[PDB]
Design a protein around this ligand. Structure first.
Ligand SMILES: Nc1ncnc2c1ncn2[C@@H]1O[C@H](COP(=O)(O)OP(=O)(O)OP(=O)(O)O)[C@@H](O)[C@H]1O
Ligand SMILES: *[C@@H]1O[C@H](CO)[C@@H](O[C@@H]2O[C@H](CO)[C@@H](O)[C@H](O)[C@H]2NC(C)=O)[C@H](O)[C@H]1NC(C)=O
Ligand SMILES: [Ca+2]
Ligand SMILES: [Ca+2]
Ligand SMILES: [Mg+2]
Lengths: 362, 260, 22
């Protein structure tokens, strides 16, 4: 009777119970199979690992990301991820819980149908529903019209939504997100003279990104500021206790979102894809999209990112337009939270697809 | 059946990425049907996976593994790794000594022994267990003594008297002096034969110390040992290496023994 | 005054979520 909410991302699965204010399980969306025969002491032979243990044991495994740029691309592996989610992470029997799943903007219909078939036929859920991630994020902010920027580990989208209706002709997809920024930070820190050779050293770079980086309001001025003083430097103590000190890499890293050319990508930056998305919509709803730009996803967490989007959109939009960026503090889990709310609403209960209905349709 | 225990100093990604050091380590490992590797400092099993990749590049089942989680009482952790040839022996069961609570293993050992039960159809002994220990130098007497309790645990758990206990026990020099041997039940009990004697040099360094040991219990197993077969494997001499190249591989020699 | 109008209005009013402790 308690519903589940499973938000599957390119990098992380966020899963938990509808009505809770945060996912209880958040773990890497990866499956690893051993490259060699053997066991861990005290254990039997295992055919695969999922999530945290796959990452921690990666050295003897072959890894697969079943979700690429938000879209499920390997079904056997995705089935392993859902199985792990239900039984190992949430520790529930999926046959006794309605399950809400999320999907990316523009997910092909055949993909959603396959998701649906697996939930009913493999996991035997009593009911389920598939929601668009961006729309859930808009909902989580108490809004039913607006434009969402959703940026995760693998993909960034802009999705304009009008009275709950995501407008697919105006959705923009940018194949640049957190994983790219982590790799770029490793690159520029290496150019400064640091080295990240072992697996443990390399894993630290994502933590540096998450703790030290930020988006400059004026990039060229910020570069001058970093060059003329040490005021922008910040230190990061490595596991061993050695403390390192980083200046302009802090803001050069997420600047890539506004200038994808930093990573060799000939593509508009997120301010311009936002604007292009709005301009694809009827002129008469644009005022409502500009005044309701909601940021969602881990890659929107950089300090400064809302102020910078406000500046750049202001420069693109008509001079009299009210522009507002909404960047909730919980926004790394916004899609999940929107699902937890929606699945809880009394007015939603008639929207579940039941196994009875599935049993009669297709 | 050729068995060895090898403390490879800071075995890990950097050492396994050195093509030269990797090639010598592979050559050493391939001497053996079972080898215990100690001092595995490999946070994500990457060095272990690379060693397996080399050993199995031709036949995928040349070597199989048993590997522990990282062990140690504080932040400094090491794994035990067994590599074995599955066509020679099969693993029947494994466990990690834990002395009765999920943390209590660390009450008597810094790195709780890994214990593997093998079926071995080519030797006189048909089933036998190996207990691995890389002892903490400053607790060597007490840890080697505690192996006697591990042996008792094996007997009770698996109903089996044939047990080899081996590894870098730090069992000589400043860590276990001559007068201390009488405090170690694994030595004073006539149940055990110590195949590597106190006179042996098991260091690749300039110390003369019998740190690494092979101890056998159980008469079948004792009867299976090839007399004179148990010794350190001086890989500097074997491979005509300089001392510096030798030390880059490890500061210890494997200790090995042959079973018939 | 349909169910969808009802649903959207409810989305706008919000929901009291249970705290998930760290
Ligand atoms: N505080 C932070 N600052 C910057 N980046 C962060 C922060 N927290 C998380 N991230 C990044 O967010 C990404 C994960 O976000 P999210 O969970 O929204 O993506 P996903 O849903 O797995 O992927 P996608 O939406 O692209 O399919 C990772 O790259 C992570 O490094
Ligand atoms: C692999 O390890 C060997 C042994 O440590 C390294 O050889 C040393 O290299 C330095 C040069 O950096 C020499 O001055 C030493 O004399 C070498 N030692 C010996 C004993 O030969 C070698 O550099 C490593 N290989 C690589 C490319 O990492
Ligand atoms: Ca996502
Ligand atoms: Ca010596
Ligand atoms: Mg001696």
């Amino acid at each position: 009777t308690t519903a589940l909410v499973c938000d599957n991302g390119s990098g992380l699965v966020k899963a938990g119970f509808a009505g809770d204010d945060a996912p209880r399980a958040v773990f890497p969306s990866i499956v690893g199979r051993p490259r060699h025969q053997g066991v861990m002491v005290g254990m039997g032979q295992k055919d695969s690992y999922v999530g945290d243990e796959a990452q921690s044991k990666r050295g003897i495994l072959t890894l697969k990301y079943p979700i690429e740029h938000g879209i499920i691309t390997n079904w056997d592996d995705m089935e392993k991820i859902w199985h792990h989610t239900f039984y190992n992470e949430l520790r529930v029997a999926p046959e006794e819980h309605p399950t809400l799943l999320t999907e990316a903007p523009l997910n092909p219909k055949a993909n959603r149908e396959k998701m649906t078939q697996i939930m009913f036929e493999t996991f035997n859920v009593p009911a389920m529903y598939v929601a668009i991630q961006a729309v859930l994020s808009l909902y989580a902010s108490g809004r039913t019209t607006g434009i969402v920027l959703d940026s995760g580990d693998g993909v960034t989208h802009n999705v304009p939504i009008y009275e709950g209706y995501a407008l697919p002709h105006a959705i923009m997809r940018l194949d640049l997100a957190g994983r790219d920024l982590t790799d770029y930070l490793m690159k520029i820190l290496t150019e400064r003279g640091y080295s990240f050779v072992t697996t443990a050293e390399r894993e630290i770079v994502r933590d540096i990104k998450e703790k030290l980086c930020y988006v400059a309001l004026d990039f060229e001025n910020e570069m001058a500021t970093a060059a003329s003083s040490s005021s922008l430097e910040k230190s990061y103590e490595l596991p061993d206790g050695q403390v390192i000190t980083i200046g302009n890499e802090r803001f050069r890293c997420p600047e890539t979102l506004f200038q994808p050319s930093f990573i060799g990508m000939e593509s508009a930056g997120i301010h311009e894809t936002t604007y292009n998305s709005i301009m694809k919509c009827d002129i008469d709803i644009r005022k409502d999209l500009y005044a309701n730009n909601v940021m969602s996803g881990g890659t929107t967490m950089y300090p400064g990112i809302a102020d910078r989007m406000q500046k750049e959109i202001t420069a693109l939009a008509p001079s009299t337009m009210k522009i507002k960026i909404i960047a909730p503090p919980e926004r790394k889990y916004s899609v999940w939270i929107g699902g937890s709310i929606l699945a809880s609403l009394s007015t939603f209960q008639q929207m579940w697809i039941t196994k009875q209905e599935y049993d009669e349709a297709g | 059946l050729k068995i060895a225990a090898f403390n490879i100093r800071t075995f890990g990604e950097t050492k396994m990425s050195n093509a030269t050091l990797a090639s010598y380590i592979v050559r050493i490992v391939r001497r053996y049907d079972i080898v215990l590797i100690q001092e595995v400092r490999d946070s994500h099993l990457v060095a272990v996976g690379k060693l397996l990749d080399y050993l199995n590049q031709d036949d995928p089942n040349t070597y199989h593994y048993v590997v522990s989680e990282p062990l140690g009482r504080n932040s400094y952790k090491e794994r035990y790794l067994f590599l074995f040839r599955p066509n020679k022996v099969s693993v029947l069961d494994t466990y990690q000594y834990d002395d009765g609570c999920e943390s209590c293993g660390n009450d008597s050992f810094s790195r709780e022994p890994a214990v593997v039960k093998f079926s071995s159809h080519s030797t006189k002994v048909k089933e036998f267990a190996i207990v691995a220990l890389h002892s903490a130098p400053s607790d060597a007497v007490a840890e080697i003594n505690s192996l006697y309790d591990v042996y008792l645990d094996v007997q009770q758990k698996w109903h089996l008297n044939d047990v080899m206990l081996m590894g870098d026990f730090n069992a000589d020099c400043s860590y276990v002096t001559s007068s201390q041997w009488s405090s170690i039940r694994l030595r004073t009990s006539s149940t055990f034969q110590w195949l590597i004697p106190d006179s042996a040099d098991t260091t690749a360094t300039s110390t003369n110390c019998a740190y690494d040991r092979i101890v056998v219990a159980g008469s079948l197993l004792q009867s299976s040992v090839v007399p004179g077969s148990a010794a350190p494997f001086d890989f500097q001499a074997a491979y005509g290496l300089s001392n510096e190249m030798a030390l880059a591989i490890s500061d210890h020699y494997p200790v090995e023994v042959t079973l018939t | 005054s349909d169910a969808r109008s009802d649903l959207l209005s409810a989305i706008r009013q919000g929901f009291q979520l249970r705290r998930v402790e760290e």
